Amino acid sequence: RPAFCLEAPYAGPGAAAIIRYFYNAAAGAAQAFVYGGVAAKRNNFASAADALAACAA
Coiled coil located at which positions? Predict the structure, then answer.
């Protein structure tokens, strides 16, 4: 899969509490996490569907 999909989710430094999805290769599933609203990495999607389409080849 895309290497970015293997990275840990990144909340980043922002003050917001936004629910986003990362692909968790360990679980083989998309999972919610809290994103702070700034400096997203690529393993960070609006929905489980978007995460699987990008990362679950």
Answer: none
Residues contacting 33, CB < 8 A, separation 6+: 9, 11, 19, 20, 21, 22
CATH class of residue range 1-57: few secondary structures
Two tokens, residue 20 = 């986003």
Give resolution in angstroms.
1.9
> Do residues 30 and 46 lie in contact, with contact meaning Cβ atoms separated by under 8 Å?
no
Beta bridge partners of 15: none
Q: What gap in Å lies between CA 2 and CA 17, rounded to an integer?
A: 26
What does the domain layout of the chain look like in residue ranges?
1-57
Task: Compute the residue count for the chain.
Answer: 57
Structure determined by: X-ray
